[model samples]
Structures are given as C-alpha cells and as structure tokens.
Target: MTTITGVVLAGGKARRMGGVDKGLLELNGKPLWQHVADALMTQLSHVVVNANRHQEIYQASGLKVIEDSLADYPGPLAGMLSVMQQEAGEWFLFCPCDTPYIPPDLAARLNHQRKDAPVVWVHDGERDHPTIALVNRAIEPLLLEYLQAGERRVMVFMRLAGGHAVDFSDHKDAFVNVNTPEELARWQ
Candidate 1:
C-alpha cells in the first residue's frame, strides 16, 4: 500500500464571506473541516490540517495542525508545502477545508490514475482544481524554489512537477467549495 497523508488546506482568507473562516462554518450540523476530516480519515493513512490560525480548535479534534512555512497566507500551495515539510508520506492528498463533500475514495482514484508522475491533480471537465491533488514528496525542492521566487500560483509548481489531471465529473459536487454564506446555505 502506498503511504499517503490527507492534507486539509484551511488557510483561506474567506474575504468573500465577510472575513469569516469558511472551515468553521457549519454544514449538516458539523463544522466544514470536521466533515472534511471525516471523509479524509476514510482514505488516508494520516490526516493533518494546514491552518495559519485556529490551531486550538483543529487540535481539539486530535488531528495535527501545521502552520504555513512562508509568511502570510500564501494560498493553497503554501499549505501543501507546510504539510509536506512535517509529514513523511510518499504522496500528500490535498483538499480545501470548505469542500466538505470530497469523494471517499479520493486517494484510491488518484493513485489509480497516477502514472509515474510527480503529481495527480483533479479537474471537473472545465477547470483544474489544483488544490485537489495528490503530490509526490519528491517535488518538495522544486516547490521550495517556486515559493522562494514568490510564485504563489499552484499551477506553476504543478506544471513543473509534470502532473496528470484526472477528470472528476463523476463526483462533481465533491469539489463544490463554500466561499459565501449563500453557498453554505445551499449546500446544507
């Protein structure tokens, strides 16, 4: 079995939601991150949260919470890099915390599509969800170089890693991340 760790990227600004943390928002009577944690727990050998703040609450759930290595919230790429620094998994499966309905077999499906590539990213038949990806740990040095160059765009590092984008239309709703109160209400 491949050693994989699930990383929940919970460091979004959530400015669209009036500065509220989307991960703390409740969905189906549970905090969005909890729902994400539940789903990831089913697929990965280990699960950790990448958050800049609110470490106490995340740690309360018994999951390890890590802060970004780069100063400021450098987007999902920073979260992935932070998790990669502390974890020893061969592959890190990442998902946004607001995306609570991620597929239960996410790891298995991504691994199935992986073909000796450094990364396996997901797409919804329209655009690629770079954060919803399975990244090989070997790309850490390249990612660090990008981060040093202040290139925060995830696709930049993904492209350098030579990723395979797998179609995830079968679980389209799985990628529906709630960025506003209206979206949260609709998802409920």
Candidate 2:
C-alpha cells in the first residue's frame, strides 16, 4: 500500500468569485473547501490545504495548510511544487478546493493508474481535469525546473511531465468546478 497525502489547492486569489477566498466561501451551509475535504479525506492517509492567505482561517478548519514556494501566485503547479519542496509525502493527491463534487472513489481510482505511470489524472472523457491527479514524488526536480521557467499551466506541466489517464466519462458531475458566483449558485 502506498502512503498518500492529499492537498487541496486553495491558494488561488479567487478573482472570479469577487476576490474572496473561494475555499472559505459558504456553500450549502459549509465552506466550499470543507465540502471538498469531506469528500477527499476519507480516501487518503492525511490531508493538507495549500493556501496563500487566510492561513489562520484555513487552519481553523483543523488541518495543516501550506503556502506556495514560488511567488506570483503561479497557480496549482506552484502549489504542487510547494508540497514537493516541503517533501511532504511519497505520493501526492491534489485537487482544487473549488471542485466540491469529486467522486468518493477519487483516490483509489487515481491510484489504480499509478502502475501505468508516475503521474495519473482524471479524464472526464470529454475533458481532463489535469490538476485533479495523483503524483509520485520522483518528479519534484522536473517540477522545479518548470516553475523556474515561469510556466503556470497545470495541464501543460502534467503533459510535459507525462501522466496516465483514468476514464470518468460517466461521472462528469464529479469534476464540476464552481468558479464564479453564478457557477456557485448553479452548483450549490
């Protein structure tokens, strides 16, 4: 059995949701990240939230919080680098805090593709949620190189680093991300 540490990528500066912390925003009477964590916690050994601000608030939720190592809010890839730089775990499970509907089997499903490659991502068939992935710690150096180049795209890094895919064509609802107020309302 592989030991895994989950990280909720909550470091974004939620511009679309009116510059407030997306994870901290309430949805259905709970913070969105809480909902996300509730769905992910049962599937992993432990969890950490990658947060740039509101550390005290995020920590108040009762889990460790990590800030990005590289500056300029370089997005999810940078958050992953933050985990790698800290050398947190053997295998890392990452997902955005905004995607509150991740499937219950997410960790195991991604872990199943571990034998296929060092990195494995969920493909909702029509589109791939590149940041929603399981990554082996071996690629940390390469991730550092990519971050140094100032590249911020998560899917680009996943492709350059190489990854296997898990088909979730039937579970499109599982990957829904509520970025804007309208999106949150629709999904809430």
Candidate with top TM-score is 1
Clashing pairs in 1: none
Q: Give the TM-score of each candidate.
A: 0.91, 0.90
Model 1 ranges off by over 4 Å: 12-18
Q: Candidate 1 lDDT, tens digit per residue, 67-162? A: 876454366787787788888867888888888888887888899999788899889777888888988889888888788788888887788889
**What is the lDDT for 10 in model 2?**
86
The ten-residue window of minimal lDDT in model 1 covers 12-21
lDDT tens readout by residue for model 2, 1-188: 43988888886544465376778888898888888888888787588888877789899878888876646546778788887777556788888889888988899878875676889889997888888889988879888888789777887788888887788888857888888667788765
Clash list (residue pairs), candidate 2? none
lDDT of 2 at 34: 82
Worst 10 residues of 2 by lDDT: 11-20
